[PDB]
Amino acid sequence: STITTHHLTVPPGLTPEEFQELSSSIAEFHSYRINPGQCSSLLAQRIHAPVETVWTVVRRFDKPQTYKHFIKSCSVGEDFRMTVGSTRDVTVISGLPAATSTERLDILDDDRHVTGFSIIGGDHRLRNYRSVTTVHGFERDGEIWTVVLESYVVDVPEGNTEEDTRLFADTVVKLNLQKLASVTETLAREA
Amino acid sequence: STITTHHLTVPPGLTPEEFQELSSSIAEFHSYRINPGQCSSLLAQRIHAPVETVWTVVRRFDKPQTYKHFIKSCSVGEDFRMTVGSTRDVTVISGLPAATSTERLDILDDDRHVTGFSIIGGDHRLRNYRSVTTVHGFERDGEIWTVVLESYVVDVPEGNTEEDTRLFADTVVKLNLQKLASVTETLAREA
Ligand SMILES: O=C(O)c1cccnc1
Numbered sequence: 023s024t025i026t027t028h029h030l031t032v033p034p035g036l037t038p039e040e041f042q043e044l045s046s047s048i049a050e051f052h053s054y055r056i057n058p059g060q061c062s063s064l065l066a067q068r069i070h071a072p073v074e075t076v077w078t079v080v081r082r083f084d085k086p087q088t089y090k091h092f093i094k095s096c097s098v099g100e101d102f103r104m105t106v107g108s109t110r111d112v113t114v115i116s117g118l119p120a121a122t123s124t125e126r127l128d129i130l131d132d133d134r135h136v137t138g139f140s141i142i143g144g145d146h147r148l149r150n151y152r153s154v155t156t157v158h159g160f161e162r163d164g165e166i167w168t169v170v171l172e173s174y175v176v177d178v179p180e181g182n183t184e185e186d187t188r189l190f191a192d193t194v195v196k197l198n199l200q201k202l203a204s205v206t207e208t209l210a211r212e213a
Numbered sequence: 214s215t216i217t218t219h220h221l222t223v224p225p226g227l228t229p230e231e232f233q234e235l236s237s238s239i240a241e242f243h244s245y246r247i248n249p250g251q252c253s254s255l256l257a258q259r260i261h262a263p264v265e266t267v268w269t270v271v272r273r274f275d276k277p278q279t280y281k282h283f284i285k286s287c288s289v290g291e292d293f294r295m296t297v298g299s300t301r302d303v304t305v306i307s308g309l310p311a312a313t314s315t316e317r318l319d320i321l322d323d324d325r326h327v328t329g330f331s332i333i334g335g336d337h338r339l340r341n342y343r344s345v346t347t348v349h350g351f352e353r354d355g356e357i358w359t360v361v362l363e364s365y366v367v368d369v370p371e372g373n374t375e376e377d378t379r380l381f382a383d384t385v386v387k388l389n390l391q392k393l394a395s396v397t398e399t400l401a402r403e404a
């Protein structure tokens with residue numbers, strides 16, 4: 023069993039200068055104790071939009087389709103409120119038949135701009151997948167931008183390599199972070 | 214058995230004016246005879262780059278990773294030449310374990326800017342999938358842009374709805390057309 027080292031390595035998508043400003047946040051929110059047979063990754067996406075514009079989208083646990091690809095539908099409770107412990111039933115059209123992903127809201131901090139979720143059921147999902155997303159505001163000479171960090175820990179399926187597990191999960195997260203950046207940059211350019 | 218109607222409907226991503234200029238091309242290259250249990254779709258993507266810049270990328274049958282997502286690797290023959298009938302073995306990391314997709318080059322027309330392929334083997338692939346991609350140059354008041362059309366026909370898996378089959382395939386094609394547009398627009402902005 024070891025502690026992940028995401029705070030010691032510049033993630034793809036981030037400059038070293040930005041990283042040095044985020045060291046304590048990555049230590050606090052994007053560190054995991056991982057066992058053999060588990061892997062973990064940290065991904066970053068720069069967004070030319072204000073933090074609260076990005077956070078308003080990121081934080082909608084009931085509307086993953088607004089920032090993620092391959093979401094056919096998402097159902098929550100009749101009296102769903104945005105509280106830790108809530109679940110969502112996502113139908114993912116990344117293959118046929120569409121898969122069910124039952125996901126738990128693990129963290130929601132509107133002050134610190136932190137959220138995260140765990141896959142707790144469904145079919146054809148990653149085993150023991152948990153992720154955390156944080157949103158960070160940057161300024162330089164009056165210019166403003168945002169950095170989104172997203173990390174996960176996941177079990178490596180027996181019969182699969184850690185290399186492929188990481189390649190799959192990284193590709194999904196990165197593509198969704200790119201959708202997040204497009205959606206929020208459009209809102210920023212337009213509103 | 215019917216003939217598809219893609220030439221009578223403006224596809225998503227295309228203006229009616231552009232469509233009226235492409236009617237004969239869609240009839241020629243993007244029409245299929247479909248049987249019950251089959252479905253077909255036409256997708257469009259506008260690209261702010263010259264046709265030959267787009268075609269140079271689109272036409273590389275041996276390098277799908279340059280315009281498509283979730284491609285872990287692509288292997289061709291030792292003396293692979295870009296000829297109809299050639300095959301490629303693509304490793305697709307859209308899930309675990311990665312899938313093998315064996316694909317046949319069906320069409321390659323460098324004059325008309327037409328290509329297409331068929332899935333002829335592998336695992337966890339669509340059954341009877343065939344697609345055709347065409348690239349078209351547009352001009353207006355000196356300004357130049359490109360339109361890429363991509364259509365497919367595919368079998369609807371027994372147990373799946375045509376709605377979900379079309380949603381899956383459309384999402385993949387559209388996302389890859391978006392990567393094509395980013396890659397070629399970057400080349401255009403830079404070269
Ligand atoms: O199987 C594929 O080709 C595929 C599945 C999901 C996402 N992208 C590609």
Ligand SMILES: O=C(O)c1cccnc1
Nearest residue numbers: 148153190191192194195
């Ligand atoms: O965030 C997701 O939904 C996700 C991320 C990685 C892999 N599979 C799903």
Ligand SMILES: O=C(O)c1cccnc1
Nearest residue numbers: 091092114116194307308
């Ligand atoms: O299973 C998923 O969440 C998934 C798989 C491929 C592509 N996008 C998402």
Ligand SMILES: O=C(O)c1cccnc1
Nearest residue numbers: 339344381382383385386
């Ligand atoms: O072009 C592809 O590789 C493709 C398109 C739709 C569905 N699956 C794969």
